[PDB]
Design a protein around this ligand. Structure first.
Ligand SMILES: CCCCCCCCCCCCCCCCCC(=O)OC[C@H](COP(=O)([O-])OCC(O)COP(=O)([O-])OC[C@@H](COC(=O)CCCCCCCCCCCCCCCCC)OC(=O)CCCCCCCCCCCCCCCCC)OC(=O)CCCCCCCCCCCCCCCCC
Ligand SMILES: CCCCCCCCCCCCCCCCCC(=O)OC[C@H](COP(=O)([O-])OCC(O)COP(=O)([O-])OC[C@@H](COC(=O)CCCCCCCCCCCCCCCCC)OC(=O)CCCCCCCCCCCCCCCCC)OC(=O)CCCCCCCCCCCCCCCCC
Lengths: 54, 92
């Protein structure tokens, strides 16, 4: 008894998501997970010597 | 463990290896500190024309003495087996 306009509106592809989409799909917060080396670990000490000459 | 399967994962000793980040440690700073005292950057590298001259004049001198060093190495290794080392005695 639903108006056909309302019935066909539900079957929009945006209304279908696989069961469990929200509990499985990864949601990365960074491309460098914790425990991986990055610039914050390789930066030289502030008392270092110029590296341009070499 | 799990090597060779879909369960493969980094062993503990690899995890410990990657836990050593050496943050704030510089054991080779002495080398750069002493190298900078040669003033190569101030004198040669900084200016492009002098940078070229270093490559050209360095290559000139370097090539000659590089050849000179290994020529002596060859003469030492083959001592007694070179034409110059064994003067020929003419048959009587
Ligand atoms: C023209 C003259 C002008 C005037 C005079 C100039 C005079 C100066 C000349 C200087 C010449 C260069 C000397 C080396 C300088 C230091 C190294 C360097 O480049 O530093 C930049 C940089 C420093 O590292 P960093 O991480 O920036 O350091 C940060 C902090 O400073 C410190 O950070 P950290 O403390 O946290 O440490 C991090 C890092 C620090 O990094 C390092 O220190 C590691 C890299 C060191 C490389 C050392 C290179 C030495 C050059 C070879 C000389 C050969 C002489 C042969 C003589 C033959 C004569 C005919 O260390 C590590 O990651 C740890 C693991 C290191 C493993 C290294 C394994 C090497 C084993 C060697 C065994 C040798 C056994 C020989 C037995 C022989 C028996 C007879 O290192 C590199 O990038 C170098 C490695 C790159 C890959 C090597 C490529 C190998 C393939 C080529 C093979 C053939 C070799 C031909 C040799 C040609 C020589 C001309
Ligand atoms: C707590 C830890 C402590 C650690 C300690 C570690 C120690 C570090 C170790 C490293 C060495 C340290 C040395 C300490 C010296 C202390 C004394 C001092 O005050 O030094 C003066 C001074 C230090 O600088 P500074 O006092 O701080 O002043 C900073 C200025 O910005 C720079 O001064 P400047 O530029 O105003 O005056 C320098 C001036 C000093 O000389 C003069 O002022 C003389 C001026 C002439 C006076 C009138 C003379 C008339 C008669 C001439 C008769 C002779 C003619 C023939 C000459 C032929 C020469 C070939 O000229 C030079 O030295 C040479 C540059 C000349 C002009 C360059 C531009 C022209 C165009 C170049 C084109 C580019 C390509 C060139 C070719 C490159 C190679 C292929 O200069 C130097 O020590 C630098 C030397 C530069 C020459 C090249 C060095 C590279 C070769 C190294 C080989 C290493 C071999 C390793 C063997 C290993 C065996 C196991």
């Amino acid at each position: 008894g639903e108006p056909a306009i309302q019935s066909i509106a539900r079957f929009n592809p945006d209304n279908f998501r696989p069961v469990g989409y929200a509990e499985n799909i990864p949601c990365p917060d960074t491309c460098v997970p914790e425990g991986h080396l990055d610039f914050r670990h390789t930066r030289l000490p502030t008392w270092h010597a110029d590296r341009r000459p070499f | 463990s799990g090597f060779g399967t879909s369960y493969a994962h980094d062993p503990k000793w690899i995890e410990d290896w990657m836990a050593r980040k050496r943050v704030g440690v510089d054991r080779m700073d002495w080398f750069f500190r002493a190298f900078n005292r040669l003033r190569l950057y101030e004198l040669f590298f900084k200016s492009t024309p002098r940078f070229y001259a270093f490559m050209v004049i360095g290559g000139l001198l370097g090539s000659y003495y590089w050849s000179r060093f290994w020529e002596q190495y060859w003469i030492r290794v083959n001592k007694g087996r070179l034409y110059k080392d064994v003067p020929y005695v003419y048959p009587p």
